[PDB]
Amino acid sequence: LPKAVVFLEPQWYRVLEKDSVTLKCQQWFHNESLISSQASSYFIDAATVDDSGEYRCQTQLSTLSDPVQLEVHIGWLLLQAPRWVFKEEDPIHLRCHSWKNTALHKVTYLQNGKGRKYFHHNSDFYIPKATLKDSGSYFCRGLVGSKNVSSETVQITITQ
Amino acid sequence: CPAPELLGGPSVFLFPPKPKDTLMISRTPEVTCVVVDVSHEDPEVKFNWYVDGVEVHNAKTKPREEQYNSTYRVVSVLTVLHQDWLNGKEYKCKVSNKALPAPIEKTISKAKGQPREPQVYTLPPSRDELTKNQVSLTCLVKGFYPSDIAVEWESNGQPENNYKTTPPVLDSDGSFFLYSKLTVDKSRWQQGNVFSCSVMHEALHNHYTQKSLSL
Amino acid sequence: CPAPELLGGPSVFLFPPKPKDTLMISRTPEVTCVVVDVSHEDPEVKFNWYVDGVEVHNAKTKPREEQYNSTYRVVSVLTVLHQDWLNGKEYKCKVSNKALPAPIEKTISKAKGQPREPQVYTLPPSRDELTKNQVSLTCLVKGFYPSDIAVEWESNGQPENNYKTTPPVLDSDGSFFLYSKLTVDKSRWQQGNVFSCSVMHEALHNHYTQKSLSLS
Ligand SMILES: *[C@@H]1O[C@H](CO)[C@@H](O[C@@H]2O[C@H](CO)[C@@H](O[C@@H]3O[C@H](CO[C@H]4O[C@H](CO)[C@@H](O)[C@H](O)[C@@H]4O[C@@H]4O[C@H](CO)[C@@H](O[C@@H]5O[C@H](CO)[C@H](O)[C@H](O)[C@H]5O)[C@H](O)[C@H]4NC(C)=O)[C@@H](O)[C@H](O[C@H]4O[C@H](CO)[C@@H](O)[C@H](O)[C@@H]4O[C@@H]4O[C@H](CO)[C@@H](O)[C@H](O)[C@H]4NC(C)=O)[C@@H]3O)[C@H](O)[C@H]2NC(C)=O)[C@H](O)[C@H]1NC(C)=O
Ligand SMILES: *[C@@H]1O[C@H](CO)[C@@H](O[C@@H]2O[C@H](CO)[C@@H](O[C@@H]3O[C@H](CO[C@H]4O[C@H](CO)[C@@H](O)[C@H](O)[C@@H]4O[C@@H]4O[C@H](CO)[C@@H](O[C@@H]5O[C@H](CO)[C@H](O)[C@H](O)[C@H]5O)[C@H](O)[C@H]4NC(C)=O)[C@@H](O)[C@H](O[C@H]4O[C@H](CO)[C@@H](O)[C@H](O)[C@@H]4O[C@@H]4O[C@H](CO)[C@@H](O)[C@H](O)[C@H]4NC(C)=O)[C@@H]3O)[C@H](O)[C@H]2NC(C)=O)[C@H](O)[C@H]1NC(C)=O
Ligand SMILES: *[C@@H]1O[C@H](CO[C@@H]2O[C@@H](C)[C@@H](O)[C@@H](O)[C@@H]2O)[C@@H](O[C@@H]2O[C@H](CO)[C@@H](O[C@@H]3O[C@H](CO[C@H]4O[C@H](CO)[C@@H](O)[C@H](O)[C@@H]4O[C@@H]4O[C@H](CO)[C@@H](O)[C@H](O)[C@H]4NC(C)=O)[C@@H](O)[C@H](O[C@H]4O[C@H](CO)[C@@H](O)[C@H](O)[C@@H]4O[C@@H]4O[C@H](CO)[C@@H](O)[C@H](O)[C@H]4NC(C)=O)[C@@H]3O)[C@H](O)[C@H]2NC(C)=O)[C@H](O)[C@H]1NC(C)=O
Ligand SMILES: *[C@@H]1O[C@H](CO)[C@@H](O[C@@H]2O[C@H](CO)[C@@H](O[C@@H]3O[C@H](CO)[C@@H](O)[C@H](O)[C@@H]3O)[C@H](O)[C@H]2NC(C)=O)[C@H](O)[C@H]1NC(C)=O
């Protein structure tokens, strides 16, 4: 009966190369294999694209966990969210994550090609109350030094 | 060298008056202070204006305008006295906003250096061009400084509808030249219409001269 | 100078060949990939070059140059074939450096759109200028496309170098024009010497035309 579930610290499943991740098991299977350590939590110090893919876990007292996909991306900026589909009135938490947490300023989160929120210094964009109007393709952008950089887009969909 | 950059807040751009505005008394020259990347959280912007260091008032500050990218843009326009600008007085725009560690100051003023009077010469079309439906009338303006200038083509008291002027180019003696090309139907040329190249510059009498050109 | 922060890592600028170089076969046209804001700590730049997506290996690698602001400027120069450039092939410079999350790719090719032949018109000095000790010989070049062009002056088989030429100016029909101004001693003009404006452009026959001007 007692199954297993994996949990990421921080929660972002889309990460950037060089990001630290911590996977929580509630033995480890990377793309269905093993690992150098069957400790409690698997720790990735500095992600690379090979760290991407599928993770399951399992303990002496608990069965094989569900599949948990980790995407490791390459780029200056990555728009992170806990997921990409939301119910009306759901809270939407977006983070414009910069490579190596390099200082990012004059940050804009865009929806469907239009600036939606602007910040002088990098901040997350938190929508407390999702509505149908929140559907569309998002990306963020900003200045690292004098260099103007943008993330790839992500599609957010809102369901009733 | 000492350029650790201001990073993360509103930015200021300070624009000069148009040359023709500074030169003709029937026009009103303005210096323009533009502030961009004003956030909605701290949208209040204060303008201070200094002429040679003497705070002035009577600047006209427009209401903030929301941009497509969801920032605010705010503009302040200071009317300038023709002779003030030409005498090389300095105009300083100071910008205060809560998101700025320190207010931002920008200065502008006319380019410096000994003013030099343009020579103006009109050149008819080359004979080889007389073969086309349209012909080129050329106005050469050279020897001028500073590079600020206005050039127009006219006929019978009205502006001509089809001319382009090159940017000023630095000659070897430190002065500038340019050419202005007026294009007219061949018929107009050969019927002996009179066309005029008009030039306005700091260093001309009445800030104005014109030269004519006709078959 | 104390080194700048360079939070963004290096930046790349990719430059086309000189117009003349692409036009005269005896000349060597080059594309130039320039990388600036290269830091002292991560100063190595790796260049890959592609022509229409196919890698080529003949690039020349220049020694890095210290800038006043305590960065390096680092350059790779690729010689191109005259006809490839003129035929619109795309040149891609890919730049790799440790301060960057991924390579920077820049591409360059000739401006697109129907080429148009320049008309070249020489104009003698104004009667009014003839009171000066030096006079202006004018070469008007109009109706060309693309804007890539070279203009020089000659007399009696010898180069005349005392000239200035304006940048190309976009005209109202979508073509470009420019003026070149050769300044000569009046006595040389009065003697009856023939001066020539030489124009090189892809849409001219043999990439070359010449118009002459003298006392009449
Ligand atoms: C959100 O959206 C915002 C708006 O869309 C966007 O705002 C833009 O931000 C840009 C910077 O991030 C800013 O870029 C600057 O632009 C300067 C030129 O601006 C003129 O030209 C533009 C197009 O060519 C126009 O779009 C501009 O509106 C502006 O146009 C001029 O406007 C003035 C005043 O309105 C007007 O003069 C007045 O006209 C009236 C008649 O109407 C009267 O005659 C008045 O008397 C007269 O005063 C002009 O006619 C008009 N000119 C036109 C249209 O041609 C440009 O100069 C800046 O470049 C310098 O600074 C940057 C630093 O960012 C350097 O990288 C660059 O190399 C330049 O550096 C300077 O170089 C100088 C010369 O060598 C040197 O002297 C300086 O030392 C040096 N350093 C400086 C100056 O710091 C720069 O590109 C742009 O203007 C903003 N757009 C608008 C519409 O305001 C914002 O960024 C967005 N935010 C986000 C987060 O995305
Ligand atoms: C530390 O110090 C560093 C050194 O000073 C400094 O580096 C400078 O950084 C600047 C950016 O920060 C950079 O600025 C760019 O300049 C571009 C043009 O540069 C040419 O002209 C300059 C003077 O005007 C020269 O100083 C440059 O060297 C360069 O000169 C050209 O060099 C080439 C190659 O050598 C040469 O061609 C080759 O010649 C050889 C023979 O010598 C052979 O014949 C070969 O066959 C041939 O290939 C040229 O002849 C030579 N030209 C001249 C005149 O000498 C300029 O284009 C850039 O502007 C674009 O990008 C900016 C964004 O930054 C935009 O704001 C701007 O609007 C332009 O945008 C472009 O617009 C185009 C038109 O529509 C469009 O098509 C493009 O898509 C668009 N591009 C983009 C990206 O949007 C820019 O201003 C400067 O070059 C650097 N200096 C040097 C020496 O490298 C560094 O920044 C300092 N760092 C700090 C932190 O302080
Ligand atoms: C960081 O970089 C990004 C990207 O920068 C850019 O890309 C790089 C590679 C470089 O090439 C840069 O040079 C280039 O800018 C920066 O973001 C860019 O910022 C600029 C400046 O703000 C924007 O240009 C302006 O766009 C606005 C908005 O127009 C949109 O909305 C219209 C509908 O209302 C629509 O019709 C437009 O098409 C456009 O929407 C989209 O535009 C993109 C273009 O990329 C297009 O592909 C899409 O199809 C289209 N659709 C959608 C859904 O988005 C526009 O208003 C501005 O025009 C003004 O200025 C013009 C010249 O300056 C002028 O001719 C115009 O008239 C107009 O000015 C006013 O016009 C009105 C009437 O129209 C008139 O009444 C006023 O008098 C007049 N006022 C003045 C003062 O002139 C201008 O075109 C870029 O769009 C934007 N790019 C992107 C991809 O977002 C970013 O800002 C940088 N910095 C930071 C910190 O992020
Ligand atoms: C676990 O499985 C995942 C997903 O199948 C693997 O991710 C993949 O990793 C490969 C190799 O690193 C990536 O290949 C890349 O392809 C591009 C071509 O577009 C190539 O140019 C690069 O050089 C690179 O090889 C691939 O993109 C990536 N796929 C995804 C969806 O992320 C992962 O490698 C596996 N992990 C282990 C330890 O085997």
mmCIF file of C-alpha atoms in Angstrom, chain A residues 32-143:
data_model
loop_
_atom_site.group_PDB
_atom_site.id
_atom_site.type_symbol
_atom_site.label_atom_id
_atom_site.label_comp_id
_atom_site.label_asym_id
_atom_site.label_seq_id
_atom_site.Cartn_x
_atom_site.Cartn_y
_atom_site.Cartn_z
ATOM 1 C CA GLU A 32 15.437 3.824 -14.791
ATOM 2 C CA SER A 33 18.865 2.875 -13.436
ATOM 3 C CA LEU A 34 20.556 3.461 -10.104
ATOM 4 C CA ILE A 35 22.809 5.947 -8.319
ATOM 5 C CA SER A 36 26.080 6.212 -6.406
ATOM 6 C CA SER A 37 24.071 6.746 -3.200
ATOM 7 C CA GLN A 38 20.788 5.332 -1.847
ATOM 8 C CA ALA A 39 20.634 8.004 0.877
ATOM 9 C CA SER A 40 17.431 9.864 1.750
ATOM 10 C CA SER A 41 17.741 12.734 -0.742
ATOM 11 C CA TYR A 42 19.637 12.896 -4.046
ATOM 12 C CA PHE A 43 21.611 16.136 -4.373
ATOM 13 C CA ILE A 44 22.641 17.743 -7.673
ATOM 14 C CA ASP A 45 25.190 20.491 -7.014
ATOM 15 C CA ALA A 46 25.497 21.911 -10.531
ATOM 16 C CA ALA A 47 23.016 20.636 -13.083
ATOM 17 C CA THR A 48 23.905 19.818 -16.679
ATOM 18 C CA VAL A 49 21.669 18.729 -19.536
ATOM 19 C CA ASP A 50 22.421 15.069 -18.733
ATOM 20 C CA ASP A 51 20.752 15.492 -15.339
ATOM 21 C CA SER A 52 17.456 15.951 -17.205
ATOM 22 C CA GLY A 53 14.839 13.215 -17.605
ATOM 23 C CA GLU A 54 12.827 10.926 -15.339
ATOM 24 C CA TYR A 55 13.233 10.166 -11.643
ATOM 25 C CA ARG A 56 11.521 7.518 -9.533
ATOM 26 C CA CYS A 57 12.266 6.468 -5.968
ATOM 27 C CA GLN A 58 11.550 3.668 -3.484
ATOM 28 C CA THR A 59 12.344 2.710 0.126
ATOM 29 C CA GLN A 60 12.571 -0.490 2.207
ATOM 30 C CA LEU A 61 9.029 0.261 3.429
ATOM 31 C CA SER A 62 7.548 1.841 0.293
ATOM 32 C CA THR A 63 6.977 0.917 -3.356
ATOM 33 C CA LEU A 64 8.254 2.495 -6.585
ATOM 34 C CA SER A 65 7.391 6.202 -6.806
ATOM 35 C CA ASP A 66 5.575 7.980 -9.628
ATOM 36 C CA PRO A 67 7.547 9.488 -12.544
ATOM 37 C CA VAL A 68 8.914 12.990 -11.868
ATOM 38 C CA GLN A 69 10.385 14.816 -14.877
ATOM 39 C CA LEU A 70 13.374 17.166 -14.434
ATOM 40 C CA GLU A 71 14.108 19.528 -17.346
ATOM 41 C CA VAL A 72 17.564 21.101 -17.335
ATOM 42 C CA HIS A 73 17.769 24.021 -19.716
ATOM 43 C CA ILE A 74 20.515 26.104 -21.293
ATOM 44 C CA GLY A 75 20.246 29.893 -21.374
ATOM 45 C CA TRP A 76 20.478 33.228 -19.612
ATOM 46 C CA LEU A 77 16.888 33.193 -18.379
ATOM 47 C CA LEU A 78 14.262 30.598 -17.516
ATOM 48 C CA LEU A 79 10.626 31.244 -16.667
ATOM 49 C CA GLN A 80 9.841 28.823 -13.812
ATOM 50 C CA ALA A 81 6.393 27.902 -12.502
ATOM 51 C CA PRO A 82 5.080 25.052 -10.302
ATOM 52 C CA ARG A 83 3.155 23.860 -13.391
ATOM 53 C CA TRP A 84 1.480 25.159 -16.541
ATOM 54 C CA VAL A 85 -2.228 24.465 -16.076
ATOM 55 C CA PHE A 86 -4.358 26.225 -13.469
ATOM 56 C CA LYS A 87 -7.966 26.351 -12.307
ATOM 57 C CA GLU A 88 -9.873 29.636 -12.120
ATOM 58 C CA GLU A 89 -8.973 31.538 -8.963
ATOM 59 C CA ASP A 90 -5.772 29.481 -8.646
ATOM 60 C CA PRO A 91 -2.581 31.347 -7.634
ATOM 61 C CA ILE A 92 0.090 31.525 -10.368
ATOM 62 C CA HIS A 93 3.684 31.878 -9.172
ATOM 63 C CA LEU A 94 6.225 32.824 -11.869
ATOM 64 C CA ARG A 95 9.949 33.259 -11.421
ATOM 65 C CA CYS A 96 12.372 34.743 -13.936
ATOM 66 C CA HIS A 97 15.422 32.744 -13.075
ATOM 67 C CA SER A 98 18.792 33.968 -14.294
ATOM 68 C CA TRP A 99 21.787 31.700 -15.021
ATOM 69 C CA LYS A 100 23.896 31.439 -11.862
ATOM 70 C CA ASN A 101 21.515 33.901 -10.217
ATOM 71 C CA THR A 102 23.376 36.640 -12.055
ATOM 72 C CA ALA A 103 21.906 40.033 -11.085
ATOM 73 C CA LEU A 104 19.017 40.877 -13.380
ATOM 74 C CA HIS A 105 17.417 44.332 -13.584
ATOM 75 C CA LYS A 106 14.648 46.080 -15.563
ATOM 76 C CA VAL A 107 12.686 42.823 -15.673
ATOM 77 C CA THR A 108 9.486 42.406 -17.702
ATOM 78 C CA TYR A 109 7.118 39.426 -17.656
ATOM 79 C CA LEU A 110 5.251 39.307 -20.954
ATOM 80 C CA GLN A 111 1.966 37.707 -21.892
ATOM 81 C CA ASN A 112 1.221 37.068 -25.539
ATOM 82 C CA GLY A 113 3.984 39.461 -26.611
ATOM 83 C CA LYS A 114 2.793 42.284 -24.371
ATOM 84 C CA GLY A 115 4.558 43.516 -21.255
ATOM 85 C CA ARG A 116 2.361 42.582 -18.324
ATOM 86 C CA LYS A 117 4.502 43.452 -15.298
ATOM 87 C CA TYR A 118 7.740 45.391 -14.909
ATOM 88 C CA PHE A 119 10.220 45.402 -12.012
ATOM 89 C CA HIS A 120 13.350 47.500 -11.464
ATOM 90 C CA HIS A 121 15.085 44.509 -9.869
ATOM 91 C CA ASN A 122 14.338 40.811 -10.450
ATOM 92 C CA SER A 123 11.253 39.731 -8.513
ATOM 93 C CA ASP A 124 8.868 36.857 -8.955
ATOM 94 C CA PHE A 125 5.532 37.661 -10.572
ATOM 95 C CA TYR A 126 2.754 36.332 -8.369
ATOM 96 C CA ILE A 127 -0.813 36.273 -9.618
ATOM 97 C CA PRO A 128 -2.999 35.539 -6.570
ATOM 98 C CA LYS A 129 -6.251 34.870 -8.446
ATOM 99 C CA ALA A 130 -6.131 33.134 -11.829
ATOM 100 C CA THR A 131 -8.751 34.057 -14.414
ATOM 101 C CA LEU A 132 -9.410 32.858 -17.964
ATOM 102 C CA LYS A 133 -7.628 35.985 -19.196
ATOM 103 C CA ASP A 134 -4.356 34.618 -17.799
ATOM 104 C CA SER A 135 -4.090 32.021 -20.578
ATOM 105 C CA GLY A 136 -1.381 32.495 -23.212
ATOM 106 C CA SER A 137 2.357 32.344 -23.900
ATOM 107 C CA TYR A 138 4.652 33.948 -21.350
ATOM 108 C CA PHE A 139 8.313 34.820 -21.245
ATOM 109 C CA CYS A 140 10.453 37.134 -19.197
ATOM 110 C CA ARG A 141 13.393 39.379 -20.026
ATOM 111 C CA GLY A 142 15.791 41.832 -18.423
ATOM 112 C CA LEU A 143 19.303 43.255 -18.395
#
